[PDB]
Write a protein that binds this ligand. Structure first.
Ligand SMILES: *Cc1c(COP(=O)(O)O)cnc(C)c1O
Ligand SMILES: *Cc1c(COP(=O)(O)O)cnc(C)c1O
Ligand SMILES: *Cc1c(COP(=O)(O)O)cnc(C)c1O
Ligand SMILES: *Cc1c(COP(=O)(O)O)cnc(C)c1O
Ligand SMILES: [Br-]
Ligand SMILES: [Br-]
Ligand SMILES: [Br-]
Ligand SMILES: [Br-]
Ligand SMILES: [Br-]
Ligand SMILES: [Br-]
Ligand SMILES: [Br-]
Ligand SMILES: [Br-]
Ligand SMILES: [Br-]
Ligand SMILES: [Br-]
Ligand SMILES: [Br-]
Ligand SMILES: [Br-]
Ligand SMILES: [Br-]
Ligand SMILES: [Br-]
Ligand SMILES: [Br-]
Ligand SMILES: [Br-]
Lengths: 450, 450, 451, 450
């Protein structure tokens, strides 16, 4: 009989009075029975509060805010499968438009074909691996032609992001990473060349180093490679990892030569969901021409009576991000992006200037558009001790919900501890002022409590 | 004067009356100026109508519908980055619960420290490549131990999905694919063994073949491999590609032994956004134990005063799907999933029965839960000419917005043309009846027009 | 133990997991029990996907898009009964303001009572029948005065829309329809006169012919009728069927004299839900003065102390459309409408120009504001053969969701097959370009597959 | 120089601080310029408040409330054109399902080919005119056959609704309306017959008289017509005007024989937007068989290879209501409707009982389901005077927003003043109690102020 009583409650009982919400959520085995949808939702929604406030997350590089239209486009495309080119043809079409534009944006040679050579991706990581395989294949072919061994390929680069380490491991490539050293936290021409040989599949400059936020200018490295060929006959290509810079420089530092204007640059990759203003789940990779992308890596698909080529490690995935990306392009344009990016740099500059007045800080990065991304990276002046450590400050800030990372650099600077503040879209001046206030407040506390 | 008149219009002009919407959308170069967001949105929204109705797309296997709560959870997590374990800790937590849960659904051995060994992925593709590298590495190690060459690895499998071909290409592995042949459109024990040798990294059965919708039972293949070892001493492992079956059999055919109940199965993968009921952008891969996943492939990350391992090709990406998947698990449970899956099978069976009464057909798949996924896959009886070809029929149906594919099988059955109807969640009986009606209607037309 | 088991499911089951959605929808008898509202809704919502995409329906003349405000106004007025003038007084009031504004747009003589004479309708059809009865009654009275028989009334017109045929049938009037003939797909002065007599209740020019999209200019027909009276003493009135043109010309071709500027025009009708930008369910009909509308057809109703006359076939009905129409008027005004209408003509012109370069077509309408509505109408150049009929092409386009009709004209042109593309609000340039693309694509396929 | 200001203002000004809202709305000529959409909306929205509260409108018979789903279905179908059968096929399909269902509800002979004869309409009015022409045509044909004059047709009826008067006028038919008289406010058998002749096209009983809310039982009238034919050989048909009753009796008084169970009833009409629970803009008319509907009144249109007849005065119009009506049918069914209608009757009965205790009243309708619609209709007992008139009361109640009509009956009862309260869906008991309270309060005031 109670089954009826209990059943009436499953019905009328409120949400927090419901019996279904009186136990802890399952975490070990697949649940047995179904439950009130509202309770299940409520439970998960509430658990998520423990993630903290994304808008206050100053560690991430990825977008933490989206405009109303992107939200709608995403919900509208929650089921559009980016991979089924023939089934969702217009989405496929839009994707191609974006490839042209990004390629265009990066000064790629006008596609005489009428359609730039590139592809969308879940993020820069996939993009990089695509670019990676591209290089390994191009290299492999070249060596086989000159009848040389192709079993000891290596990749030369500076302080790259973890995904390159992953590439090297998964595709068995020796990663020759020029280490960071006091005074030079990046790959310089000299040390680069000293690492190149006939087995080098390419060099990967990082146009926007994660750890520091500074650009790794390709120009000088490009020259060095030109000379290197003149001296050894070894022709080395470049792949720019512009996850960050890719959607920054083009708008606020158009004179920095880092893209396809450089001959050795055969491919560029960037994260659309970082400064590209697209929602998480979007990356881009562009090749300078059909000759830069080995046909053996491309798998053709049926697209509108013809055949379009694909090259992606993933398969089925939402098309929402690409659609949104295209939206931001049409809605903002160069003008728009510039204004938005400036806003970020403006804030980064401000914080850098202000924070400098509150302690013995040596700034590694101060949001100068001609030097890198809208970031503020710094460490304690060597030797000097203010009473705290950057780790300490960080913690204090976390008490107000802020996530401002404090970490050690790598290579030959493992004893240098820096703090890095990222100024993404949606971290307006007024909001950043609050950060500053809590920063001053934190110092005061650390002072009164040695 | 003019600029002000123009501007006042840019301000009061209605959406369609405005000047910004009087030109074709940009598709070749990055836009120069910003424009009214409502126009930009409208343009894109409308272009998307050319994608067709996803609910009527009977070709895809991925979810084309999501409940109200998933929509909310997705919008709420539009900016949660699944990769930043330390920054969005609870999302990370929830993900782990999921793995546990999936591993449980597949009989994985009682996990160690309360946490099964697995990872979430963008889709089955990434999952499979993860499982792939796992095998190659396990094999490589083994061979090096016995001091044998590891430069000629091959993978044995039946009619796999394109991602495996991609795996083989990207990771340089010989793909030995047992071809489909009339009467046997899958990998049989005999032909499998004839393809295995000491260089075989593993066998990949496809628990839910795409082309036909039928299961490729691992049991028989497993026995064959047991014997094979007894005769050659060669121990071969399996990796089940359960993109489809993975979230079907467990609920409607629990007695089919295909998972971890089989000793040789070291890893299983499945598409969460297919029959897992998760929105696009979610896949799963589980390993039998810590010994099946080579530590060299794992990159530890900081997480809750300790180190957690991560294995993925991607990096930054939305955590929405994993959060949603967890939701569907708690809200539905075995009971729920069963009910939902049954609904699908019920429809597939209905269509298969009805369609049979309208033409000279030989069914390859008829929505039998004990044979495979909820799909209807048939062909014209060898030697019959009803007046039309399945291609013709597909096109007549598209006239009503339906997408019912007609294609040729591969291997030794390249001259066999089949039609395949997928019955996903959200293709209820009443809705399928309408397909049937249009089906009958199409036949009538094709009849009246020889 | 089973009813509770099954009940708990009714409660907890998923939408599609639910048992209620495991059967086909009822279609023969009134359902017996109630069911989960969400399921019932889901079922219907999904069936509707089979209607196709309205935005891609290039056959219809009626609005296929509405702004956010109209949507709200409609939702807000889902229960306001347009007929209960005394119960929903302000709606009634707003309605009247519209009649005044339409009458003003059409130059109707300025009313001295302050309120023009006209009424709102569900659509042009009802409007036309109201205008029809008006004429029959005016005629009937006139004849009875001159002591003549009133049992053989006829109506003269060109290629009218089906509703007129319906009028003729329902109200027993002989319909003398001047047939379309190659080179002249409309009613010309000469053939018109040859059909008029003392039994003719009136002539109905169609200011925006459906089949071709061209205007049927009243000016010349008006003159002809003036002469006709001078020679026979027979005074014939006109009723313009401006379902389309009514809300087009006034903004993009103000010089075309077709409205009340013409003396014989006693009444005009137009579809508000067509180019009037109102949501489906709105039409208008205006009379030039209180003398053009026979009081015997009017039913006065109590309205705020005084009296107000009601002339309409339908009784109860949504006031939403009227309210929305008024909104569009205030929000857009002449300026607004003009910009919107231009956008349409602009697209129609573009398509017409581009499609012409793809084959041996002879155009019947190129979207010129001075000739007709925003539409592109055409046929295959007489005696030509590119390897396909316009019907085939139509089909090829349906495969992309487009609905572009291909049909045969009537009268003496029954062997001429045309295709007609309608460019309504919400068929922006970028969107139309996609149509063009698919059009080129269709031709290519038809080419590679002669069979 | 001032313009640029007016513009900047028209851009930032709030809705009410804007200049566009400082003038009275245009009401004489078509506006010249466009204006801020928000202002235009606001203006109209606010004017509409002067309409009063529809939920409190107890004079109307039409729905004044709709469930959330109907609202969505209506918004979803704001652009579906009910007339374009070929262009919006499924809506057309749904429509037909309703026709069968209503026919089934009224006991029409089970259709011959799975489809009953009838059509949807904007409201009962159009439905009645369709039924009217039907009769005139049937009659006309009959007479022509027997070679008799067809220029003096008349229609016999009781206290019909205004639309019939309109029918008579527009289609030139003599309306013989048996007048209401004290003690008999409806058409009785005897006076009906005394009005019938060979020129009578039919008799129209009103199954739910507006003025009083009581049913006009067809049974007795039907018998009288049977006899009439036996004595004169004149066969007269009936057309029931069940605008109200049509969707009431079937559920709460199934034993009242008034529909197609009666042989002479060749057509029935009813307002779906009244007690059919459909939103305004929906009516129905059903014919007993293909022989009752003159093919000359039908016009055919191409629909799915075939064709279907369309009898309808209107043309283009929304399909939302029909779609909603179908929804209410499936969601409620007999069970549902019965529960909803009972709720209304229950309220009507309650008010009738309570109001009777407040003054010297004589009731004409007390919400009995076996006598008529859920309404309360009373007058002051003859020659009795409480100190007011039903007009005063009506007015006093209006002061609280209530619209409770007080009017005089017609015919030979023009000196009888009645008050009529309509109890539609959405006038629940608790709500009605408030009316009662204000009713008592009104009486008290009228008492203290002679
Ligand atoms: C952030 C970043 C990546 C990773 O890109 P995702 O979008 O996370 O896939 C790779 N390289 C660099 C230099 C980065 O900053
Ligand atoms: C659909 C499918 C895949 C690809 O799944 P994704 O989610 O797109 O990665 C892989 N394998 C099989 C057997 C499949 O059916
Ligand atoms: C569309 C049209 C009609 C029909 O009027 P509705 O508003 O659709 O009821 C009548 N006449 C003409 C000339 C039309 O174009
Ligand atoms: C309300 C009513 C009508 C009017 O029909 P509408 O649905 O209002 O168009 C006609 N007859 C009767 C008996 C009515 O009650
Ligand atoms: Br609560
Ligand atoms: Br609650
Ligand atoms: Br956001
Ligand atoms: Br340093
Ligand atoms: Br507009
Ligand atoms: Br707008
Ligand atoms: Br959805
Ligand atoms: Br076969
Ligand atoms: Br579900
Ligand atoms: Br649900
Ligand atoms: Br819309
Ligand atoms: Br012609
Ligand atoms: Br304000
Ligand atoms: Br405001
Ligand atoms: Br409501
Ligand atoms: Br009485």
């Amino acid at each position: 009989k109670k089954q009826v009583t209990d059943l009436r409650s499953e019905l009328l009982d409120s949400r927090f009075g419901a019996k279904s919400i009186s136990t802890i959520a399952e975490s070990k085995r697949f649940p047995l029975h179904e439950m009130r949808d509202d309770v299940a939702f409520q439970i998960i929604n509430d658990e998520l509060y423990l993630d903290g406030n994304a808008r206050q997350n100053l560690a991430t590089f990825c977008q933490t805010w989206d405009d109303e239209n992107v939200h709608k486009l995403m919900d509208l495309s929650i089921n559009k499968n980016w991979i089924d080119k023939e089934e969702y043809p217009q989405s496929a079409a839009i994707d191609l438009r974006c490839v042209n534009m990004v390629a265009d944006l990066w000064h790629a040679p006008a596609p005489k074909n009428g359609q730039a050579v590139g592809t969308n991706t879940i993020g820069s990581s996939e993009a990089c691996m695509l670019g990676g395989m591209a290089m390994k294949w191009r290299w492999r072919k070249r060596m086989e032609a000159a009848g040389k061994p192709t079993d000891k390929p290596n990749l030369v680069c500076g302080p790259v992001q973890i995904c390159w380490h992953k590439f090297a491991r998964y595709w068995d490539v020796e990663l020759r990473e020029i280490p960071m050293r006091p005074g030079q936290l990046f790959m310089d021409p000299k040390r680069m060349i000293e690492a190149c040989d006939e087995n080098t599949i390419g060099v990967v400059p990082t146009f926007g180093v994660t750890y520091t936020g500074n650009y790794e200018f390709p120009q000088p490295l490009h020259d060095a490679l030109d000379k290197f060929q003149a001296d050894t006959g070894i022709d080395i290509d470049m792949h720019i990892d512009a996850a960050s810079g890719g959607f920054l420089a083009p708008f606020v530092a158009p004179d920095i030569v880092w893209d396809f204007r450089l001959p050795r640059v055969k491919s560029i990759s960037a994260s659309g969901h970082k400064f590209g203003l697209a929602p998480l789940g979007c990356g881009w990779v562009i090749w300078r021409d059909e000759e830069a992308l080995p046909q053996e890596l491309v798998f053709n698909v049926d697209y509108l009576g013809g055949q379009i080529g694909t090259f992606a490690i993933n398969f089925s995935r939402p098309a929402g991000q690409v659609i949104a990306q295209y939206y931001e392009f049409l809605r903002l344009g160069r003008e728009g992006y510039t204004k938005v990016q400036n806003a970020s740099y403006q804030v980064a500059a401000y914080l850098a200037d202000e924070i400098a007045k509150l302690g013995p800080y040596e700034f590694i990065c101060t949001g100068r558009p001609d030097e890198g991304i809208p970031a503020v990276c710094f460490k304690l002046k060597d030797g000097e001790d203010p009473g705290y450590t950057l780790y300490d400050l960080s913690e204090r800030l976390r008490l107000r919900g802020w996530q401002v990372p404090a970490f050690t650099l790598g290579g030959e600077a493992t004893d240098i501890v820096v703090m890095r503040i990222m100024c993404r879209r949606g971290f307006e001046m007024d909001f950043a002022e609050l950060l500053l206030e809590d920063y001053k407040a934190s110092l005061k506390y650390l002072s009164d409590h040695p």
